[PDB]
Design a protein around this ligand. Structure first.
Ligand code: A1AHA
Ligand code: A1AHA
Ligand code: MG
Ligand code: MG
Ligand code: MG
Lengths: 231, 248, 242, 196, 204, 244, 244, 222
């Protein structure tokens, strides 16, 4: 109320209301899910259009041949953060001949988002990110919130109505966690997961976007007719 | 990160500059000080009001030497006065001594200090100085002079004046006791009298601070061998001299 | 108005932030005093370690600024350590630039000028601390100089600071009025420490164990702080008196 | 210039000559090339008098600040400060410095820092234009854990030879003994060390 | 060739009985080629006169700068600057460009308006002050001027005699320098009167 | 952050006025009146001191009339210290023009530079404007004698006769009442002193409450004469305002 | 007046800085973290709330390392703690680069303290929303420190912060009173496991994962190491048995 | 140039010649090379005369400000440190070679500063082109426990040796004596051993010898 004028202000309870408003901006974004086994990691995003004459905005961004993410919320903030992640991967590769570990990428995104929440001027990022990757320690899925908190999970979902998909993942854990060496089955699991967050809508080739990375499979995005075989 | 780049002193709809008025209020609530211009010198005086008998009043000097021929006293906030004395001592060198090889005349040092205080009333993220200064000096081409500098940065030459709480009564007394033929000792005596009314407690050589801009004292120079180099015109009176003059 | 938030004048001509920093100086509920012997300077401060989980050796408000200068702070420990680090740096730089040890009063004036800067500039807040500097200056002898959030500083025959400061000040005033000298006429610093502890016990009306005090002694060419057992020995010597 | 520092059973001793030259002219014949940076951490300076004095003053400042913040520094720390200064300004400095210290834990250490800013911990170290002429001699006479008198004799003989052969060296022989007992200063005049 | 010898010229100042004198040549050239016969090298601010030998562009720049500074000095102090104070100002202004100085050799002359005492001084290009009691020389014929002055000068000369002396010094020094001459001016300065005379000299 | 304490000194009112400029003009409206009158053979400036005390040293006192160079002077109305800042910058600009062109600076160029400084203070920087109004009296070889006025807004205009500070309505009415285009400098002196004596908020127009200046011909040269207290007393007894 | 709690560096009339106290509230909302000093090292323990079973166990590590000998854990806003750890790593690198030796634990504590305190001097920055327990072994032995959002820090025999700080401090007081000789590193690891399990009662809603690290002169040779595998399982079993 | 400094039992003396040269030409026959850094701290300079004057003036101004700030008499070690660090900062391009002497609350001190920033301490010092002559006297006649007059004569004789045997030195001998208790006394032209003989003629020309083309009066009023 009187403590939401900027990010540099604590509330009497100890809250940062600008960060919470950014989280709200996320919760209004379109739904996207992430889930990984032990050999692959898959991103399934539901794209949102302006009207029937418009396109469905992209939600999955490639950061490196082994790492990518999906967005929910303010798309320009996702562009900024994914460009930073691209540079970090690029710096790792160029200076150390080393693919950037997904864990360190999450740490870097956390530290980048944090400094926007402690200094006057500016604002927290208005986007949430789901980062899939395959590195020296296998497949990885991260959830990033603009508060700075980044967590690794077997699966998750963000955006509007994401709780149905998230509880489905909580139920399907023992099943999808061992879909090793079969990418199409992991993508089927992801589509089944994102179906829980559908209210008065069904998946079409225009609004469905999938991404996959893993062992011997570079981070690749399937859009349009390519995803028709999962509908 | 200094984000106060805007002025903290702005014009009110009535035309007043509020922070300057409030600094003048702080000056008016300070201990009285005064200056008197004689024919062969100038006198500046004030009261040393110590907090505790354990405090050593002699360590803190309210009357400060600016140049060998220029001294200053104040009324208002002590720390502002101390930092102003430091800045003035340095500006007397950088902006004059190092350019002309001589110490600045009283008018110009007063103008430099006034520039500092004016900037304090207009620069970004600062408050005016909460002091008023009485600067007494002597230079070769203008003689003896006595100036008052206010928080706004304005300055005025005075034959005699006083600032602080007892400023009005002291000013009236000075008006009724000042002439243009007063010797230095006459001005010292009138200054002691004018101080005697504004001081409530003890009144002796240890409770009041008084200095003069009079003749050159070569004994205070520290070296001999240059006939053109005479002693400083500034001299602080000791407790002994003040008490000796208090007898009459 | 916002003349209560930043260091600008109130219509009464006051700086309320300076006054509230003065108020914050008492937050620790600790009293301290400083006195001068014949050839030394002693500071006593109350030591209160309430939490048993604390390492009592790290709970101190007396700082060694240099080989010769010691400083005891009345205020919260963050601003206290801020001032301590700044004073140590200032003393080191003074020595490097001018070729001799920074005097007690000069360091006091420097810290007071910085406090005045905080008093006049809006972006810097005052430090809620009172800094008592003590030493045996090679020109002035035993010295006590104290600074406050207002940028004020002055020297003292003796001094006291804290919630019960006035009582300690009156006690020392009465003693020096009776003695008619501006110092403790003792050749050993141990007896001056004993004097200080005795008069603080009197003024505060409380007894102290060896863990209720911090003691700092400054002699020619060294300032140091006493151990718990040295304080205990002083307390025993005091107890054996009449 | 002829300087050296030798570790022995009770601590460490630094030794130097007292000759400062401008060209072939002896600008000073009583120079004190033994400089203190901390109570029991000293240095022998060689090379540019200005450079060595500036470096020593800066190191003394840094060690005073280190003492005020964290207490007594190790000899290794003083050598590291000297090394940082000499290496980061190798293009504008010409200073060879022998840092010698004593603490109750390590019982005295010697670090040599030549041109370029490298640092080497040694039982003893020699440096200066005269040092060359005594290399062999020192390598034939130094032993570990000598006595105070043995170490003083070793340094006196080495510096006597260095002064004899090097025109840049000469004057008196200055020594600083750092032990648990403290700091002692020794001087030896030409009428004494020339007969050796 | 070098900046202090491209244009050439000489200035010389002398003191007498309650008077000073300052003279200069009129030549401005570019090495061998003589360019201008009217290049005077003595300016005045109030009652303080300043001659400047050396690089001509720096002479003009210094004249303009000192006019600037003396005007501001007069406005602030409400009086004319005195020869001693202007000497100090010249020295400080020169040293301000210590490692890239003006290639000049200034000379200050005047009568102190208060004491009435004659005053002269000279500077090198970085501002070292020589406050001579007898005479000051500067320019490409500095050695010739030095010899002429050390031979001819005697103290306490009356203005009509000091004029002849300084004129002979200047002329006979310029006639042994390929880069000096081409006319000359001489100022005789008394506390309340300044006369300026153009000398007739050989034009080669 | 610090935005909450920002007075925003360079913003527009809903009516299209600058708050701080209007308030600085309100401040100047309480300053001692200053009058300039331009004649065919000279210019006269006359300013009134405020609340002078008897112990005030009027010999070395200067609060109204300042020299910019030898051909341009200024009468100030408002904060003396802001005025002195602007005066020093104006003197520096005049000397810069002289050094660059070897000619004295024309009056309007200096006036416009100072006015542009003021305008800058009224459009960017977030600082308060100078509470000063200037009357410039100058002479150049293009427009001869010139009288200008400038205010905190950075606006400047030219005048045959003008007043700034307190009681400018009545003073301007009187000036317009008695001014003739052909009048000489002495008649302008009389008119200025009479206007001041009729508009002064004090009992009588005595010499110690006055600063006076004339830019005249005396040779082909212009002369700036800043009147000493005795000269002000003498011109006052000459005009008949005071008795000998 | 009112509104003092709206800017970061503003004193209240009672002398406090309410923004720091709101940060302290943010800290009190956090999970429980503790540190235990033993006779030759330190142990650090933290509760990690299992928000969902989708979280990968043993990942999402909270305890951070500084240099090779300092352990740091914090309660409150995890990103603020990470920022403080980044600064501390810079300070330690700078100290080592200049002085060769790794930074002593008190020196590192004062570095962190000066940083946090500086974050209470201006209204342009927000105080840290974490309380940080840290420490390790240096040339003078073992050191444990706790640092509050005000910049205040102290050395502790045992320290605890977060939602379960009360019961944790009670258990630590019991351990201190009963063991004047000091705990061993392994015994302190077991006691840290027990204290985390006990303090979980104040956050008993969700299930938790225990995370322990230690720096022991004998058990880890003066280096910071995470307690993994058999030792971690043994400490978990000790705590499970002792709470039942 | 020949500058020397000699300590004595209760203070310190410095001395210098008065010859200033532009290469081989004598620019100033009466140059004051003894500079006052503070009332009781003086310094003799050699090398670039402008550089010596400038650094001594600058360090003296800063020393005066420092003394007003600290409310203490200035110390010789302070001027020494400031001059040293300034000269070192400029890598010897400030060609000032100084002998700094003074009495302060800590006693009497005599130091030398090289243009590159190196400092030396001793009981007798000499710098300049004539130093080798002056030092030759010093090493011949210096002894411990010199009286005031003894040290004054020793410094004067060193400066005289420099004057006679060095082409870069000559004319008069300036001295500055600084005793522990007294003020510093600055003896300008303590010796004048190079008075010029009377010239064989007067070269006053008969009025009208010089040919004038035109004359005019120049106004200096304002
Ligand atoms: C404790 C060490 C004692 N060292 C000496 O006594 C000896 N002398 C000095 O260091 C004093 C002499 C003095 N005070 O004038 N300084 C200079 O010479 C100074 N340099 C100069 O004056 C010049 O460049 C003139 C000629 C320009 C015309 C500073 C400089 C600059 C670069 C540089 O590489 C050196 C010294 C240097 C490096 C190594 C060895 C020697 C050096 N210089 C020696 O002569 C030397 O042989 C020294 O051993
Ligand atoms: C207390 C010390 C007293 N020293 C002297 O009197 C002696 N004289 C000066 O320093 C005065 C003399 C004066 N009045 O100009 N300055 C110059 O000579 C000036 N030189 C010039 O104008 C020119 O170069 C013309 C041709 C334009 C290019 C400045 C300069 C420039 C370079 C330079 O290397 C030096 C001095 C220098 C360095 C060290 C030693 C000496 C030097 N010059 C000596 O001759 C010297 O031997 C001095 O000892
Ligand atoms: Mg200061
Ligand atoms: Mg010719
Ligand atoms: Mg020809």
């Amino acid at each position: 109320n009187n403590y939401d004028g900027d990010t540099v202000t604590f509330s009497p309870t100890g809250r940062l209301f600008q960060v919470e408003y950014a989280l709200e901006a996320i919760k209004q974004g379109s739904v996207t899910v992430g889930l990984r086994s032990n050999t692959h990691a898959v991103l399934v995003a539901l794209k949102r259009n302006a009207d029937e004459l418009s396109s469905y905005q992209k939600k999955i961004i490639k950061c490196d041949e082994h790492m990518g993410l999906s967005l929910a919320g303010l798309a320009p903030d996702a562009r900024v953060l994914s460009n930073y992640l691209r540079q970090q991967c690029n710096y790792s590769s160029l200076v150390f001949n080393r693919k950037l570990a997904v864990e360190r990428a999450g740490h870097l995104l956390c530290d980048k988002a944090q400094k926007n929440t402690q200094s006057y001027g500016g604002r927290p990022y208005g986007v949430g990110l789901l980062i899939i990757g395959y590195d020296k320690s296998g497949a990885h899925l991260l959830e990033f919130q603009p508060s700075g908190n980044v967590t690794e999970l077997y699966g998750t979902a963000i955006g509007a109505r994401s709780q149905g998909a998230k509880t489905y993942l909580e139920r399907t854990l023992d099943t999808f966690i061992k879909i090793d060496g079969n990418p199409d089955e992991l993508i089927k699991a992801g589509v089944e997961a994102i179906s829980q967050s559908l209210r008065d809508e069904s998946l079409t080739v225009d609004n469905l976007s999938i991404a996959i990375v893993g062992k011997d499979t570079p981070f690749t995005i399937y859009d349009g007719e390519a995803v028709a075989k999962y509908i | 990160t200094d984000r106060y780049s805007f002025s903290l002193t702005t014009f009110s709809p009535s035309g007043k500059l509020g922070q300057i008025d409030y600094a003048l209020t702080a000056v008016k609530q300070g201990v009285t000080s005064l200056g008197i211009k004689a024919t062969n010198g100038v006198v500046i005086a004030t009261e040393k009001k110590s907090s505790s008998p354990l405090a050593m009043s002699e360590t803190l000097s309210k009357v400060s030497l600016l140049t060998p021929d220029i001294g200053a006293v104040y009324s208002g906030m002590g720390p502002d006065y101390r930092v102003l004395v430091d800045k003035s001592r340095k500006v007397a060198h950088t902006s004059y001594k190092r350019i002309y090889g001589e110490y600045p005349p009283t008018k110009l040092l007063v103008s430099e200090v006034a520039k500092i205080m004016q900037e304090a009333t207009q620069s970004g993220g600062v408050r005016p100085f909460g002091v008023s200064l009485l600067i007494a000096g002597h230079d070769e081409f203008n003689g003896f002079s006595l100036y008052q500098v206010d928080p706004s940065g304005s300055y005025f030459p005075w034959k005699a004046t006083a600032i602080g709480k007892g400023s009005v009564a002291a000013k009236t007394f000075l008006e009724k006791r000042w002439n243009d033929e007063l010797e230095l000792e006459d001005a010292i005596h009138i200054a002691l009298l004018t101080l005697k009314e504004s001081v409530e407690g003890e009144f002796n050589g240890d409770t009041i601070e008084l200095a003069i801009i009079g003749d050159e004292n070569p004994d205070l120079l520290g070296y001999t061998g240059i006939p053109t180099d005479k002693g400083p015109r500034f001299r602080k009176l000791t407790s002994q001299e003040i008490n000796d003059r208090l007898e009459a | 108005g916002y003349d209560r938030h930043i260091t600008i004048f109130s219509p009464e001509g006051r700086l309320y932030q300076v006054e509230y920093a003065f108020k914050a100086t008492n937050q620790t509920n600790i009293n301290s005093l400083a006195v001068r012997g014949k050839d030394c300077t002693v500071v006593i401060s109350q030591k209160k370690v309430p939490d048993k989980l604390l390492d009592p050796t790290t709970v101190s408000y007396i700082f060694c600024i240099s080989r010769t200068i010691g400083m005891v702070v009345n205020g919260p420990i963050p601003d206290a350590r801020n001032a301590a680090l700044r004073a140590k740096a200032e003393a080191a730089e003074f020595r490097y630039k001018y070729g001799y040890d920074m005097p007690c009063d000069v360091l006091a004036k420097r810290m007071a000028n910085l406090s005045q800067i905080y008093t006049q500039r809006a972006y810097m807040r005052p430090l809620g601390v009172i800094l008592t500097f003590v030493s045996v200056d090679e020109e002035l002898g035993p010295s006590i100089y104290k600074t406050d959030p207002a940028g004020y500083y002055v020297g003292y025959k003796a001094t006291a600071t804290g919630p019960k400061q006035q009582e300690i000040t009156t006690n020392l005033e009465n003693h020096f009025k009776k003695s008619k000298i501006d110092h403790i006429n003792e050749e050993s610093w141990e007896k001056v420490v004993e004097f200080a502890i005795t008069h603080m016990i009197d003024a505060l009306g409380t007894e102290f164990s060896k863990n209720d005090l911090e003691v700092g002694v400054a002699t020619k060419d060294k300032f140091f702080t006493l151990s718990a057992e040295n304080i205990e020995e002083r307390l025993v010597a005091i107890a054996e008196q009449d | 210039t002829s300087i050296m520092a030798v570790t022995f059973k009770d601590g460490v001793i630094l030794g130097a000559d007292s000759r400062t030259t401008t060209g072939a002219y002896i600008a000073n014949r009583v120079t004190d090339k033994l400089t203190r940076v901390h109570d029991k951490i000293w240095c022998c300076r060689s090379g540019s008098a200005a450079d060595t004095q500036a470096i020593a003053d800066i190191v003394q400042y840094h060690l005073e600040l280190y003492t005020s913040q964290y207490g007594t520094p190790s000899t290794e720390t003083a050598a590291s400060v000297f090394k940082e200064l000499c290496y980061e300004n190798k293009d504008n400095l010409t200073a060879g410095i022998i840092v010698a210290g004593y603490d109750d834990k390590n019982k005295g250490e010697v670090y040599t820092i030549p041109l370029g800013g490298s640092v080497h911990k040694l039982p003893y170290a020699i440096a200066g234009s005269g040092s060359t002429f005594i290399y062999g001699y020192c390598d034939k006479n130094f032993r570990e854990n000598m006595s105070k008198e043995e170490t003083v004799d070793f340094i006196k003989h080495s510096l006597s030879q260095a002064i004899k052969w090097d025109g840049s060296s000469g004057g008196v022989i200055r020594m600083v003994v750092l032990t648990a007992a403290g700091v002692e200063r020794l001087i030896f005049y030409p009428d004494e060390y020339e007969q050796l | 060739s070098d900046p202090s010898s491209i244009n050439g010229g000489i200035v010389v100042a002398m003191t007498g009985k309650d008077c000073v004198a300052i003279a200069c040549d009129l030549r401005l050239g570019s090495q061998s080629l003589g360019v201008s016969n009217k290049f005077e090298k003595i300016f005045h601010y109030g009652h303080v006169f300043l001659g400047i030998t050396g690089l001509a562009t720096d002479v003009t720049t210094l004249n303009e700068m000192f006019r600037y500074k003396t005007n501001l000095y007069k406005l602030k102090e409400e009086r004319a600057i005195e020869p001693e104070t202007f000497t100090q100002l010249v020295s400080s202004s020169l040293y301000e460009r210590r490692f890239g100085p003006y290639f000049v050799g200034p000379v200050v002359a005047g009568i102190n308006s208060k004491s009435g005492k004659p005053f002269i001084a000279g500077f090198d290009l970085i501002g070292c002050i020589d406050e001579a009691k007898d005479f000051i020389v500067s320019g490409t014929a500095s050695d010739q001027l030095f010899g002429m002055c050390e031979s001819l000068y005697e103290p306490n000369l009356e203005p009509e005699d000091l004029f002849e002396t300084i004129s002979q010094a200047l002329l006979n020094a310029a006639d042994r320098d390929a880069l000096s001459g081409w006319g000359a001016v001489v100022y005789i300065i008394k506390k309340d009167e300044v006369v300026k005379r153009y000398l007739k000299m050989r034009q080669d | 952050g610090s935005r909450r304490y920002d007075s925003r000194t360079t913003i527009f009112s809903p009516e299209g006025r600058l708050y701080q400029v209007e308030y600085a003009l309100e401040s100047i409206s309480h300053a001692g009146t200053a009058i300039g009158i331009m004649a065919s053979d000279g210019i006269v400036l006359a300013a009134e001191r405020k609340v002078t005390s008897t112990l005030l040293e009027q010999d070395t006192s200067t609060e109204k009339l300042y020299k910019l160079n030898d051909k341009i002077a200024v009468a100030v109305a408002g904060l003396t210290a802001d005025a002195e800042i602007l005066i020093n910058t104006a003197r520096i600009h005049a000397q810069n023009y002289l050094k660059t062109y070897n000619e004295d600076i024309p009056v309007e160029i200096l006036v416009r530079r100072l006015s542009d400084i003021k305008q800058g203070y009224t459009q960017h920087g977030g600082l308060r404007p100078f509470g000063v109004s200037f009357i410039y009296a100058g002479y150049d070889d293009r427009y001869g004698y010139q009288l200008y006025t400038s205010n905190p807004s950075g606006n400047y205009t030219g005048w045959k006769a003008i007043s700034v500070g307190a009681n400018t309505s009545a003073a301007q009415t009187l000036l317009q009442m008695d001014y003739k285009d052909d009048m000489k400098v002495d008649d302008a002196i009389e008119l200025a002193l009479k206007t001041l004596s009729k508009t002064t908020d004090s009992s009588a127009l005595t010499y110690d409450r006055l600063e006076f200046a004339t830019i005249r011909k005396g040779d082909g040269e212009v002369y700036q004469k800043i009147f000493k207290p005795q000269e002000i007393k003498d011109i006052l007894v000459k005009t008949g305002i005071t008795k000998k | 007046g009112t509104g003092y709690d709206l800017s970061n560096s503003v004193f209240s009339p009672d002398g406090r800085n309410f923004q720091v106290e709101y940060a302290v509230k943010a800290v009190e909302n956090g999970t429980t973290s503790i540190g235990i000093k033993c006779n030759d090292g330190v142990v650090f323990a933290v509760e990690k709330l299992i928000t969902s079973k989708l979280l990968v166990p043993q990942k999402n590590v909270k305890i951070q390392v500084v240099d090779r000998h300092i352990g740091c854990v914090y309660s409150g806003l995890i990103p603020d703690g990470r920022h403080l750890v980044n600064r501390g790593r810079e300070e330690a690198a700078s100290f080592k680069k200049l002085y060769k030796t790794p930074i002593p634990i008190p020196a590192f504590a004062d570095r962190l303290g000066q940083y946090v305190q500086a974050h209470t001097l201006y209204n342009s920055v927000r105080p840290f929303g974490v309380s940080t327990i840290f420490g390790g072994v240096d040339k003078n032995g073992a050191h444990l420190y706790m640092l509050e959002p005000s910049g205040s820090y102290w050395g502790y025999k045992g320290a605890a912060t977060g939602k379960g700080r009360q019961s944790a401090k009670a258990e630590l007081e019991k351990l201190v009173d009963h063991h004047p000789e000091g705990l061993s590193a392994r015994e302190a690891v077991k006691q840290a496991a027990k204290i985390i399990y006990l303090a979980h009662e104040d956050n008993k809603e969700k299930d938790f994962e225990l995370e322990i690290s230690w720096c022991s002169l004998s058990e880890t040779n003066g280096l910071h190491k995470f307690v993994k595998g058999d030792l971690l399982q043994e400490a978990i079993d000790f705590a499970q048995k002792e709470i039942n | 140039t020949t500058i020397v400094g000699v300590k004595f039992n209760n203070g310190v003396v410095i001395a210098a010649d008065t010859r200033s040269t532009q290469g081989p030409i004598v620019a100033d026959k009466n140059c004051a090379k003894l500079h006052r850094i503070s009332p009781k701290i003086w310094c003799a300079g050699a090398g670039t005369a402008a550089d010596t004057e400038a650094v001594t003036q600058l360090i003296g101004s800063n020393i005066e400000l420092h003394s007003l700030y600290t409310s203490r008499e200035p110390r010789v070690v302070s001027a020494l440190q400031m001059l040293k660090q300034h000269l070192f900062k400029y890598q010897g391009h400030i060609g000032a070679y100084l002998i700094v002497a003074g009495v302060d609350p800590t006693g009497s001190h005599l130091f030398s500063i090289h243009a590159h920033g190196s400092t030396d301490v001793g009981y007798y010092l000499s710098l300049g082109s004539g130093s080798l002559a002056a030092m030759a006297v010093l090493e011949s006649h210096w002894k411990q426990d010199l009286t005031k007059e003894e040290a004054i004569k020793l410094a004067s004789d060193a400066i005289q040796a420099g004057i006679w045997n060095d082409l870069g030195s000559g004319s008069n001998v300036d001295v500055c004596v600084m005793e522990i208790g007294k003020d510093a006394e600055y003896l300008r032209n303590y010796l004048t051993p190079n008075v010029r003989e009377e010239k064989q003629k007067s070269y006053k020309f008969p009025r009208g010898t010089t040919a004038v083309l035109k004359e005019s009066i120049v106004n200096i009023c304002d």
